[PDB]
Amino acid sequence: GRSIPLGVIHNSALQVSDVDKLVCRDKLSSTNQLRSVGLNLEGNGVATDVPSATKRWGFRSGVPPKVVNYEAGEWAENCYNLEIKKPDGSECLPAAPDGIRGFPRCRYVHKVSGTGPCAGDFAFHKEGAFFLYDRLASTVIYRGTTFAEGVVAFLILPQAKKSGYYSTTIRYQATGFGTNETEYLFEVDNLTYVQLESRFTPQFLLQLNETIYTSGKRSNTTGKLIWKVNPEIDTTWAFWESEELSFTVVXXXXXXXX
């Protein structure tokens, strides 16, 4: 056990404290001075690509899920939305409970559909973080519901005080989800796919998708076309700081070189 820390401003700096450790000059005149806020793991420098992010989550039985509310959040660049089944067709994730909606500000929504063994009743965050929904934070992942990874803080505010929204969905297929041998594919259309790499940024995927549509490199067949990208092409530090490609074909695999 431990006491839940509380943020307070003293000597022009934020400090951790608690209601029992304040001096008489600190003043709390209404419950409106207290706030709960959610901060995104994005802002701490974590890798946000789909292969790296999914390795932070895992399945576990025997632990009941828990939910806590928060009042304000941060605009997210990367969010995630999962539709995972077992190879026998059964769902791996539970439907979203009544009143739990997706995170409300996501520049990119990485939507992953696929299969895995799912050896556990619920999927938790392996580092103890939370999955942030619409002003509710949960310890587990809900099916088909957009979330951002984050953590919660509690504040006392001082007495005094001193563009639109665009969202783009990026779809993926996955096999062996949640294991050591997971493979990912970025979806151009229902029959044209790109083998995914950890180094691919969102805008690289969107522009690679554009060149495929405008160069006419989609599948013209009943069958599935999968493009591979050689190491020596360039791909677009943290998020806050073309004609040149050539396509050759070898299901059906192929390679895109510079």
């Binding site: 431990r2 839940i4 951790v16 209601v19 901060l39």
Partner: protein
Amino acid sequence: EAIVNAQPKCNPNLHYWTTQDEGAAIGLAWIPYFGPAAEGIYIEGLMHNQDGLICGLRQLANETTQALQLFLRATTELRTFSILNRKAIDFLLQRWGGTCHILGPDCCIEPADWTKNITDKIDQIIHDFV
């Protein structure tokens, strides 16, 4: 204790979303039947890293997680909304849960003016002592 950000990076700007706290509604927009849907109830804001508050806040949320997760493990409530109300109650009990001994360090009663009300009346009877 003070807060030491020990993260690999810090985004020094906070672009946030929340619901509106102040200002009356415009016309019929407060009626659920006519008002916005769930996606349109939000306002936005932006604050910069003055006094290092943004990077401190990121570290604070990180350090809060262990105690918060242990609290959630021990509660049987499915959804917890009462943390801030309980903090407010504990604030009041710490200062007013016992007898307030004036001039003591744990009693937030100032009789400074109360002295100058009585120490100005030193010459209410000691000086008009004709």
